[PDB]
Amino acid sequence: PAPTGQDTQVSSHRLDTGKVPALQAAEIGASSNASDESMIETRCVLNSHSTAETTLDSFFSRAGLVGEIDLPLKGTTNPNGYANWDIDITGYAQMRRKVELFTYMRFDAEFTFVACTPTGEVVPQLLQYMFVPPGAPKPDSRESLAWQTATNPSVFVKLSDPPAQVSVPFMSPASAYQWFYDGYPTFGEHKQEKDLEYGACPNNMMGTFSVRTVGTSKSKYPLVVRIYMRMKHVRAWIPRPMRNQNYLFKANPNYAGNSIKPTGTSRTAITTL
Amino acid sequence: GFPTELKPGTNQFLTTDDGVSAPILPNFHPTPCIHIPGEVRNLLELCQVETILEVNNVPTNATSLMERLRFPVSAQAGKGELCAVFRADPGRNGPWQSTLLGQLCGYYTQWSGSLEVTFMFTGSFMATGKMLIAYTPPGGPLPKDRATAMLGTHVIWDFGLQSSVTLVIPWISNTHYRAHARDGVFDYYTTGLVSIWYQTNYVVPIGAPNTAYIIALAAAQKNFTMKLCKDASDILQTGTI
């Protein structure tokens, strides 16, 4: 157990040969073991500082942005009032850097969708969020027959209402999600084309997210939807060094090779602050 | 789910309400609290500490603003002359506005209890004399002479080694509580008056000063209580800060 930090015991001076706490051999590969009460003269301190804020749940159970959907009136992206979005977390840096500290995670989720006009104004309009598992029919238009949601879960909500939220279980075939996959997903020959599938893990492709404005004709307002994600019941394994350089592509550790930068800041000389 | 109903009191932000709200920091532990001397557990604890009273609140200019803390005393012709008068209303603007009790009482509408005013003599060692301090209950106007003031409750103060005497203003009232008194209708809650009269003289031998000063300290007794919190009548700003 470790509910609080360790105390400090009273120590005195020592002058004896043979026992040397200070000298070490870091070539072995293990951290130090010399403490404060073994290299200087210390007093008695009763530490009562809590360590409950550094747990995995306390560090990951905070909402963050992961998605963005645009439904414009005039444009080229989604001019038909419907959109399809594949579920990915690696789209934004703040959450990605946090979740990429470890290799395997197992967790539930709580998704919250906030919708408003591009100017921030709220107007009366109705929508339908539909969760499309892999292998289900994906809608292709605003009046697609697949919108009957006979089996797939769906949510009807209005803009003027408070943002809708749902709870999500752990749906992976594996024992945990993995953000790094050193290998290929097919038994092929890997000549050149397969290299575009390097690291593509099928165990992380959880489905598709579909949104439309309920109606037959075109709507009257442009709309934007923001998807926020929060983690709970989190377990982690095998931590790895944190990210250093900028991100370039989703689900790819690629970095700008010509512009490489140090981790921290720099100074002029080593003998001067 | 469970059917409910909404009463006509929803969506209102009431400042004095006591309610539950969602915390922003989950699993947060504050810094431990060490022992710091001088803890206050009730505003009434420091309502019984004597503070200087401004009986002589005549002057106003900048250079003489310190002269308001004492009033002079000298030798007269021994005819029972008057020294100083004031009203014993803690909440009403006047001499009592300069004390901690007076400032705190401005935050509360109604008060009840007995007050206590202490006078200290700061003259030479060879100067002697006696004074009479009288408290006139409500109804009687300001006394015109000593023989009329001596009827109410009073105490005779004798100069000597013990240089301080305390006049206790007992809680004499018709109602259980009194609101703050002011000119007009609200004079119904006036507590009375306080007067100071020469008893015999201020006697002083040769080679000693002829003028001395008195310092008055006021406080409250052990049965002093206040209720019905409100906001003060003075705002200490003249725009944006």
Partner: peptide, 30 residues
């Protein structure tokens, strides 16, 4: 944990158990 539905994964995060094993990563020496 507080739950209002029939599914355990819809409950709150709750309070975990404070245990640490710092020797797993810092002192893995045989």
């Amino acid at each position: 944990t507080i739950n209002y539905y029939k599914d355990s994964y819809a409950a709150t995060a709750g309070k975990q158990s404070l245990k640490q094993d710092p020797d797993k990563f810092a002192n893995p020496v045989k």
